[PDB]
Amino acid sequence: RMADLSELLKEGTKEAHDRAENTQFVKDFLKGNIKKELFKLATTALYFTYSALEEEMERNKDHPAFAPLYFPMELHRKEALTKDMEYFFGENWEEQVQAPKAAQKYVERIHYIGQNEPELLVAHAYTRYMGDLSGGQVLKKVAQRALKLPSTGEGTQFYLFENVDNAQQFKQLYRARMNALDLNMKTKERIVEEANKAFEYNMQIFNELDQAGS
Amino acid sequence: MADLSELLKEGTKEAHDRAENTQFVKDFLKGNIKKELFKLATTALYFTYSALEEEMERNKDHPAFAPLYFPMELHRKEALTKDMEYFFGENWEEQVQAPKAAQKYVERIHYIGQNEPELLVAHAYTRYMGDLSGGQVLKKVAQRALKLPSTGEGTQFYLFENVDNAQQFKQLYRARMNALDLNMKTKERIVEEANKAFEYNMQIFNELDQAGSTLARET
Numbered sequence: 001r002m003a004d005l006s007e008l009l010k011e012g013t014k015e016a017h018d019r020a021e022n023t024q025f026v027k028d029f030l031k032g033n034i035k036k037e038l039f040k041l042a043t044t045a046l047y048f049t050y051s052a053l054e055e056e057m058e059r060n061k062d063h064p065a066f067a068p069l070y071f072p073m074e075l076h077r078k079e080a081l082t083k084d085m086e087y088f089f090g091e092n093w094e095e096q097v098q099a100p101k102a103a104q105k106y107v108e109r110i111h112y113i114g115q116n117e118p119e120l121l122v123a124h125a126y127t128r129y130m131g132d133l134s135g136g137q138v139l140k141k142v143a144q145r146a147l148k149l150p151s152t153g154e155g156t157q158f159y160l161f162e163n164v165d166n167a168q169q170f171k172q173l174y175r176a177r178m179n180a181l182d183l184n185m186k187t188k189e190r191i192v193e194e195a196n197k198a199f200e201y202n203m204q205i206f207n208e209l210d211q212a213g214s
Numbered sequence: 215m216a217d218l219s220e221l222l223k224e225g226t227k228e229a230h231d232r233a234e235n236t237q238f239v240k241d242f243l244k245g246n247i248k249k250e251l252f253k254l255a256t257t258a259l260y261f262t263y264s265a266l267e268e269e270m271e272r273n274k275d276h277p278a279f280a281p282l283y284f285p286m287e288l289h290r291k292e293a294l295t296k297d298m299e300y301f302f303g304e305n306w307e308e309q310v311q312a313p314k315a316a317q318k319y320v321e322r323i324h325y326i327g328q329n330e331p332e333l334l335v336a337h338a339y340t341r342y343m344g345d346l347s348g349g350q351v352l353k354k355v356a357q358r359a360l361k362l363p364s365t366g367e368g369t370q371f372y373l374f375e376n377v378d379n380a381q382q383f384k385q386l387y388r389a390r391m392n393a394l395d396l397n398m399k400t401k402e403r404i405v406e407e408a409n410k411a412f413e414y415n416m417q418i419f420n421e422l423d424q425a426g427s428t429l430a431r432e433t
């Protein structure tokens with residue numbers, strides 16, 4: 001069974017995941033070292049890639065190689081980030097935004113795959129959403145304590161999946177479906193290789209956010 | 215359209231242009247640097263090269279990198295492992311940690327070698343093709359400035375005791391990179407990262423500059 005797309009991807013992106021857990025921006029975040037301005041930008045970055053990613057998934061919502069993975073009800077974060085961008089920046093937020101150069105590359109790549117290698121879109125949904133379902137609960141608590149944020153969710157409506165009531169088993173439904181997709185082994189390897197690229201896109205954002213400290 | 219060996223130089227223009235001009239560098243070519251800082255730098259080198267060297271070892275048989283594998287002539291690990299002996303002592307391995315501006319550049323080198331090997335050449339050309347140019351001087355320069363053995367003791371990093379003529383070897387290297395067959399934006403990409411690689415060094419330089427000041431601001 002270690003031949004399932006979800007199995008391949010896990011073993012296939014292990015090294016990249018380790019780099020992510022240990023990247024200085026992530027460790028300094030978890031310790032509560034990141035202040036508000038670097039949090040407002042972290043969110044800003046998050047917004048783009050997820051808005052872009054969701055518009056792109058919104059595009060192939062009925063594609064044979066992505067159809068099931070489509071889950072606007074349970075996953076999409078744009079409605080959440082938006083409310084979060086409203087809390088920190090305010091309704092005016094829109095007329096202020098500016099993405100980390102890396103976030104830009106990230107998005108452009110989310111668009112390329114958007115019409116060129118569509119059978120690899122799952123690599124971007126996987127990397128981002130699945131991670132979100134694994135430790136979002138913890139990140140929410142760290143963010144609230146360091147920035148003195150309300151427990152009622154203000155500013156963090158992003159780290160919470162209102163429509164998902166059980167992350168653990170939820171991701172299983174996702175793995176069961178990722179594997180169900182009609183895919184040849186040749187492409188899967190391209191998917192795994194694409195998930196790894198995706199982590200690096202996040203690695204680059206994490207890298208740019210750190211320097212932002214100075 | 216053209217040889218990759220020139221697209222890099224022409225392409226990274228601003229990189230090696232915004233490189234000969236970095237406080238840490240100007241403060242180096244001459245002789246004003248504080249031993250304990252030179253030790254920070256050497257540490258950065260150890261972790262950067264250990265990573266870059268493993269990735270090339272991994273991609274040695276990769277058609278997109280094989281022609282640029284020169285372990286016995288270009289590698290610096292063994293050497294650096296020694297230039298860290300003289301400075302940090304013996305059991306320094308368990309004490310010294312990879313500085314942050316270096317850990318970034320590092321984590322990246324493991325990505326490339328593992329996921330985008332056709333770009334490993336960019337990092338190789340960024341450091342090695344660089345080390346070979348004007349290395350001997352650096353040793354001596356740091357020796358007299360830090361009261362170190364002229365011979366090179368403690369800094370065998372700047373000396374490749376396995377390469378005869380430097381200009382001849384590098385000219386050799388350029389011909390090897392050009393023989394590589396790839397796409398077009400592939401060269402553009404390779405160059406993009408050589409610049410990306412430079413910045414990585416930049417972050418590492420002043421990261422030391424400010425670190426050396428935090429060593430001066432105290433007195």
Ligand code: HEM
Nearest residue numbers: 006009010020021022026126127128130131134135199202
């Ligand atoms: C300190 C930081 C992080 C920690 C401690 C962490 C921890 C974990 C843990 C324990 C799991 C395993 C859950 C399971 O398999 O059921 C997981 C899964 C996941 N994480 Fe992370 N993670 C971190 C950062 C990230 C980042 C930065 C990304 C990518 C941007 C990421 C992407 C994922 C993905 C895709 C999964 C699902 C793997 C799978 O089940 O196939 N994680 N993470």
Ligand code: HEM
Nearest residue numbers: 223230233234239243339340341343344345347348412415
């Ligand atoms: C310490 C200050 C520096 C000085 C004075 C300096 C000087 C030079 C000189 C004169 C050359 C010879 C040109 C040739 O190869 O024909 C050269 C080449 C080179 N240097 Fe620098 N350099 C410096 C810093 C750097 C830095 C920070 C890097 C970046 C890692 C670097 C990377 C290179 C590379 C890649 C080459 C090969 C160029 C070629 O293709 O010919 N150098 N450098």
